[PDB]
């Protein structure tokens, strides 16, 4: 404040003359365009939302490094030339990016999933800690992991559990967001995933819930979209072309692999297919600890009693078990849930899945 | 519709249809899977005849493979009064 | 003017003609002497 | 114009001419008139032409609607016209809306047919909203002819908004 | 004379303020056109510009003119918000099990939201009705937004999606804008409803375009916005071609079924609809429901019109006991006719 | 003229020999192009075939795999063949349009003949059936020579 | 010091851009996918203004007009997917992405997946190795090599590596065109890339041009007649005319690859397009005996083992799946604390990939 009063204030007065020549080129009737390709001859392609696709020349405002193909810029109504670039801080460039460094989930906190740990540890932690073991065999360790089951137990816990021991940064990317709202950004978002995580790379990319883009059907038309093929074809080249010592890792998740593109699978690059395992007594107590924390319970309520007799429910039915237990207190007009409500609600959810399996077989 | 209007505006007009089994027919269960164009043509032919605007001098000739495979609603009197075999 | 507008003539009363442009616009114009009624047909330039 | 229709003629007079002429008979009894009637039988024979004869005695505006209409490759225009024709009949009390062979537009989908068949269940919600959605008030008479129907009962049957069901006598 | 000079205008578009620029400009998204950077009015400071603020942009010079009221003008297909809803729970009354399940789900968090936060369970934001078709749920739908003093809103997913460019997105996002300002309201989800009120058996082939938008706005509203007192009410009796992920939390919370019909179920319904009518003293309304077969709530409601037709031929406002059983026998045979 | 026989006997090879001596334009109709995912493409395809043959008079149309589009049977299962059904229907309609032009030839080389039709046998359509059997002892000696 | 020179590029040049650039951009104005002007009318002659947009289309007649640089406005002048009348010379189809393919001259890979299969070797020795070595004997022989080679079967099994094996002894340049990268959203680029293949092949002779998974883009589809984009149509015109008629096939070869042989272009099934046809089958115990021995040469393992028993544990399967077995050999050996793969290491490694296929 005091230091910059004798610096920035006389600086803006001497720089006011250069700002006057800018505003003359700027103009009041501006517009937002869309970039396509940038060439060293100072020319580009811009489009306003009414789709009058144009081709104009690039003037001198900001460095070309700030300009990227597929972005939005500023235009004027005379020559439709680019008068400036639009700030991308408000509009996220990628789909969903969440950087979690050193997460809480570890191998010992996920319960009896250790059977799945031995498979993911050899394909992730083993090449990272001892890369010289693969150099003697001359083989490429698979960087991909295929996950099965339902979220909240197998997919949610194991995703952040591998990053703790490997000291990796967890990045969660939504799979249904791979087709994003715009045409031409398919190959751009694929490179930004490996570009941001490529400089340092103590990170593992995670993708979940792809029901769509993995299916190109029989064509790109008659109900299909071109954005689906832009991301799928570029993801195959970026995954197969980029090879490293095991720093960058990309892990997807899907319930059914029969609908996915077999060419996108690229056999031999991803050798790891991990099935879904049922939770043990340790994992089931972890799900209960989250919901029963805010839920009122007496001193006679123990997590070991509920998991003793159970149908071995998934993460969806366990969450619904404590949900039904809360309705018994609302009908009786009480804020304290006793131990009888947890046992009564456990039998109702257990009987809604498997009972007699249509008794038979002589 | 435009053929119905062109027949009213210009009296000397004769309409001839060939192989109406494609646009007609009872199909199987009378359900529609990509079949909406079959009922689209049949319902319009029966609706223009029973409306308040009829065709006095306009004659429409239809042809098909079998008469029994068509819509029985058209064969009833009041719209199509002429059923003639060609042996 | 050499670059004429691309359209199709749907109707050749006798000296009147109707043309349908490819811009989803329909205009009415009288027939001139530089064209023939057989030369005006749809699916043509 | 055609005899032997006294079975159907007594049904039309009660569901059309009765609420149109004297509206005070319903308030005295404490009952409300139905918002429509379903006609089952072959069209064109003692049926379709009889519907046009209703506008003669009632002196009402007859709206001719075909089930093969509103065919388009776009969306949103078809379902919008069902609401617009209802409000169009609200300004003019003597109005009558008729639909020929509702069996084509009342057929639902037991399986997903993907393209080009999506418009059969999109048009059904608007016909039901203009009747089952609103309360009971009749500014117009709704008559739906049916040539043949195996099972179509999406909301249509039961006397929620539609009480009487007319059937063409064979004997 | 001064008015004639004011009536001449080049025109002004409609847009909403997005952000604020240090260059004394503003980024405003024009709904019929798009995002355009324009100039802020000289008589209006840039500090008063907020996010999603409704303003007025001139057509001629493409700049801010004045600041109108802040509202989202709805494009109206079936979605127009009505006023003064007319219904009651005494008209659809007579069902004990259904009313208890509706109050503990919809009406409970609205009146006392602190009961769920103190207990430690999230309040249900949605419910799917179950039951046979034509139980009389069409009349109680108006009473849901009436007794709760909420805004009556009906949503049609078909009319908000069009094959035209830009017409299948902005319409769906228009619902999300007003849902925040109207938040004390209950949203009605139609076209998926199999309950029988309006039953199309759902649409799995026509929703392929809207699933990429509407399903994102409904899930982001609860999770990201955390806006309470907003009830998304869906209905169906079966999940087959719809979203298989609805069973996950955030969409389906509570499930309200329908009680089996019996003599005691139709005895109270017949008495309610007969209050507007006039009955002779000494007529038992419970014996009428005993002779009924497979009659739902709407079957009894339709008997009133049929019962008044027999007495109208004799021109009597009072329906004798002889005409009731003759009318009920005809209404019961409507489904079994031919 | 109708032509049937196994492939390799010259059914597709001799099709150009008739247009070479008569100075006619060879127009081939591909078999998979007749199968279209869009419904209603058979009407414009047949009309455009004779439209190009109207401007250029010496034009011969060659059809490949006649048996694919040549069997409707009697059944109601045509819902999947609905594009194939109207293909033969428009063929009968366009050939009746201009009866004064004999310079437009329609040739279909297929394996055999199974489903007949009274409409397909008449003037301006397939009439003479020329069998293409397997070559005999002395026939293979002349071909190999 | 350098702070002024950094902003000097955007200051001093901006003054010249006011008069200079605005004058060059007058008239409402390197791959360009949209060629259109806005309200440009001149005269009669020198008007042009061809608009590809659906609104206000135009065409230009009156003979042939060719300009070296500027036709009317220069710049946006273009054609793209719809060819308008008589003007070839200025397509905006040039995308300097043409290096996307893989050109390998004299590949050093000899026997990789080729060993073990006798039938596929002998079929490609006569039509490839011989003409690329002594083509003069074929001029005396009287006949010509086949215009095309049809390779159909499971992909990634060595179908591509089989062309690299025969090209080793002849020192031929191996050019592979991947069908996955061949399919692009840009319409009109496929016609230029194929034309540049034969033009570049004449510069350096003794090369082999290979195409992978031709059914990806397809030789015959429903988008040719019904659709409005021209890709395969103009590709087949440059494929048949350039190669067959004026170009000798001795030093220039074109080999395709596919899966279903009946889904190809029926134009290629006619005589005079594709003659040589080689069928690929799953390798037997003898076929896979030499496959595992080649891959094990790169890795360091125990030489006292036998690879004929390893190939017996796995049933008949595509050769592309055999590469994943070697990647699992050096993994389970680490769990046993063995830097090399012993005899017992391949026992659990082969049994792991068998249960993963679930066939």
CSV table of N, CA and C in Angstrom, one decimal, chain A residues 185-238:
chain,number,residue,atom,x,y,z
A,185,UNK,N,-13.8,-29.8,-28.4
A,185,UNK,CA,-13.0,-29.9,-27.2
A,185,UNK,C,-12.6,-31.3,-26.8
A,186,UNK,N,-13.0,-32.3,-27.6
A,186,UNK,CA,-12.7,-33.7,-27.3
A,186,UNK,C,-11.2,-34.0,-27.2
A,187,UNK,N,-10.4,-33.7,-28.2
A,187,UNK,CA,-9.0,-33.9,-28.1
A,187,UNK,C,-8.3,-32.9,-27.1
A,188,UNK,N,-8.9,-31.8,-26.8
A,188,UNK,CA,-8.3,-30.8,-25.9
A,188,UNK,C,-8.3,-31.3,-24.5
A,189,UNK,N,-9.4,-31.8,-24.0
A,189,UNK,CA,-9.5,-32.3,-22.6
A,189,UNK,C,-8.7,-33.5,-22.4
A,190,UNK,N,-8.5,-34.3,-23.4
A,190,UNK,CA,-7.7,-35.5,-23.2
A,190,UNK,C,-6.2,-35.2,-23.0
A,191,UNK,N,-5.7,-34.1,-23.6
A,191,UNK,CA,-4.3,-33.7,-23.4
A,191,UNK,C,-4.1,-33.0,-22.1
A,192,UNK,N,-5.1,-32.2,-21.7
A,192,UNK,CA,-5.0,-31.5,-20.4
A,192,UNK,C,-4.9,-32.4,-19.2
A,193,UNK,N,-5.5,-33.6,-19.3
A,193,UNK,CA,-5.3,-34.6,-18.2
A,193,UNK,C,-3.9,-35.0,-18.0
A,194,UNK,N,-3.2,-35.4,-19.1
A,194,UNK,CA,-1.8,-35.8,-19.1
A,194,UNK,C,-0.9,-34.6,-19.0
A,195,UNK,N,-1.3,-33.4,-19.4
A,195,UNK,CA,-0.4,-32.2,-19.4
A,195,UNK,C,-0.2,-31.7,-17.9
A,196,UNK,N,-1.3,-31.5,-17.2
A,196,UNK,CA,-1.3,-31.0,-15.8
A,196,UNK,C,-0.5,-32.0,-14.9
A,197,UNK,N,-0.8,-33.3,-15.1
A,197,UNK,CA,-0.2,-34.4,-14.3
A,197,UNK,C,1.1,-34.8,-14.9
A,198,UNK,N,1.6,-34.3,-16.0
A,198,UNK,CA,2.8,-34.7,-16.7
A,198,UNK,C,4.1,-34.0,-16.2
A,199,UNK,N,3.9,-32.8,-15.7
A,199,UNK,CA,5.1,-32.1,-15.3
A,199,UNK,C,5.8,-32.7,-14.1
A,200,UNK,N,5.0,-32.8,-13.0
A,200,UNK,CA,5.5,-33.4,-11.7
A,200,UNK,C,5.2,-34.9,-11.7
A,201,UNK,N,3.9,-35.3,-11.8
A,201,UNK,CA,3.4,-36.6,-11.8
A,201,UNK,C,3.6,-37.4,-10.5
A,202,UNK,N,3.3,-36.9,-9.3
A,202,UNK,CA,3.0,-37.8,-8.2
A,202,UNK,C,1.5,-38.0,-8.1
A,203,UNK,N,0.9,-38.5,-9.1
A,203,UNK,CA,-0.6,-38.5,-9.2
A,203,UNK,C,-1.1,-39.8,-9.9
A,204,UNK,N,-2.4,-40.1,-9.7
A,204,UNK,CA,-3.1,-41.2,-10.3
A,204,UNK,C,-4.5,-40.7,-10.7
A,205,UNK,N,-4.8,-40.8,-12.0
A,205,UNK,CA,-6.0,-40.3,-12.6
A,205,UNK,C,-7.1,-41.3,-12.3
A,206,UNK,N,-8.3,-40.9,-11.9
A,206,UNK,CA,-9.4,-41.8,-11.6
A,206,UNK,C,-10.6,-41.4,-12.4
A,207,UNK,N,-11.3,-42.3,-13.0
A,207,UNK,CA,-12.5,-42.1,-13.8
A,207,UNK,C,-13.5,-43.1,-13.4
A,208,UNK,N,-14.8,-42.7,-13.3
A,208,UNK,CA,-15.8,-43.6,-12.9
A,208,UNK,C,-17.1,-43.3,-13.6
A,209,UNK,N,-18.0,-44.3,-13.7
A,209,UNK,CA,-19.3,-44.2,-14.3
A,209,UNK,C,-19.3,-43.8,-15.7
A,210,UNK,N,-18.9,-44.6,-16.6
A,210,UNK,CA,-19.0,-44.4,-18.0
A,210,UNK,C,-20.1,-45.4,-18.5
A,211,UNK,N,-21.3,-45.0,-18.8
A,211,UNK,CA,-22.3,-45.8,-19.5
A,211,UNK,C,-22.5,-45.5,-20.9
A,212,UNK,N,-21.8,-44.5,-21.5
A,212,UNK,CA,-22.2,-43.9,-22.8
A,212,UNK,C,-21.0,-43.8,-23.8
A,213,UNK,N,-20.0,-43.0,-23.5
A,213,UNK,CA,-19.0,-42.6,-24.5
A,213,UNK,C,-18.2,-43.9,-24.9
A,214,UNK,N,-18.2,-44.9,-24.1
A,214,UNK,CA,-17.5,-46.2,-24.6
A,214,UNK,C,-18.3,-46.9,-25.7
A,215,UNK,N,-19.5,-46.4,-26.0
A,215,UNK,CA,-20.3,-47.0,-27.1
A,215,UNK,C,-20.4,-46.0,-28.3
A,216,UNK,N,-19.8,-46.4,-29.4
A,216,UNK,CA,-19.9,-45.6,-30.6
A,216,UNK,C,-21.0,-46.1,-31.5
A,217,UNK,N,-21.7,-47.2,-31.1
A,217,UNK,CA,-22.7,-47.8,-31.9
A,217,UNK,C,-22.2,-48.2,-33.3
A,218,UNK,N,-23.0,-48.0,-34.4
A,218,UNK,CA,-22.6,-48.4,-35.7
A,218,UNK,C,-22.2,-47.2,-36.6
A,219,UNK,N,-22.3,-46.0,-36.0
A,219,UNK,CA,-21.9,-44.8,-36.8
A,219,UNK,C,-21.8,-43.6,-35.8
A,220,UNK,N,-21.5,-42.4,-36.3
A,220,UNK,CA,-21.5,-41.2,-35.6
A,220,UNK,C,-22.7,-40.4,-35.8
A,221,UNK,N,-23.7,-40.9,-36.6
A,221,UNK,CA,-24.9,-40.1,-36.9
A,221,UNK,C,-26.1,-41.0,-36.5
A,222,UNK,N,-27.3,-40.5,-36.9
A,222,UNK,CA,-28.6,-41.2,-36.6
A,222,UNK,C,-28.7,-41.4,-35.1
A,223,UNK,N,-28.6,-40.4,-34.3
A,223,UNK,CA,-28.6,-40.5,-32.9
A,223,UNK,C,-27.3,-40.4,-32.2
A,224,UNK,N,-26.2,-40.6,-32.9
A,224,UNK,CA,-24.9,-40.4,-32.3
A,224,UNK,C,-24.3,-39.0,-32.5
A,225,UNK,N,-23.3,-38.7,-31.6
A,225,UNK,CA,-22.7,-37.4,-31.6
A,225,UNK,C,-21.2,-37.5,-31.9
A,226,UNK,N,-20.7,-36.5,-32.5
A,226,UNK,CA,-19.2,-36.5,-32.9
A,226,UNK,C,-18.3,-36.2,-31.7
A,227,UNK,N,-18.8,-35.6,-30.6
A,227,UNK,CA,-18.0,-35.4,-29.4
A,227,UNK,C,-17.6,-36.7,-28.8
A,228,UNK,N,-18.5,-37.8,-29.0
A,228,UNK,CA,-18.2,-39.1,-28.4
A,228,UNK,C,-16.9,-39.7,-29.0
A,229,UNK,N,-16.7,-39.6,-30.3
A,229,UNK,CA,-15.6,-40.1,-30.9
A,229,UNK,C,-14.3,-39.3,-30.8
A,230,UNK,N,-14.5,-38.0,-30.5
A,230,UNK,CA,-13.3,-37.1,-30.4
A,230,UNK,C,-12.5,-37.5,-29.1
A,231,UNK,N,-13.2,-37.8,-28.0
A,231,UNK,CA,-12.5,-38.1,-26.8
A,231,UNK,C,-12.0,-39.6,-26.8
A,232,UNK,N,-12.8,-40.5,-27.4
A,232,UNK,CA,-12.4,-41.9,-27.4
A,232,UNK,C,-11.2,-42.2,-28.2
A,233,UNK,N,-11.1,-41.6,-29.4
A,233,UNK,CA,-10.0,-41.8,-30.3
A,233,UNK,C,-8.7,-41.2,-29.7
A,234,UNK,N,-8.9,-40.0,-29.1
A,234,UNK,CA,-7.7,-39.3,-28.6
A,234,UNK,C,-7.2,-40.0,-27.3
A,235,UNK,N,-8.1,-40.5,-26.5
A,235,UNK,CA,-7.7,-41.2,-25.3
A,235,UNK,C,-6.8,-42.4,-25.6
A,236,UNK,N,-7.1,-43.1,-26.7
A,236,UNK,CA,-6.3,-44.3,-27.1
A,236,UNK,C,-4.9,-43.9,-27.4
A,237,UNK,N,-4.7,-42.8,-28.2
A,237,UNK,CA,-3.4,-42.4,-28.6
A,237,UNK,C,-2.6,-41.9,-27.4
A,238,UNK,N,-3.2,-41.1,-26.5
A,238,UNK,CA,-2.5,-40.6,-25.4
A,238,UNK,C,-2.1,-41.6,-24.4
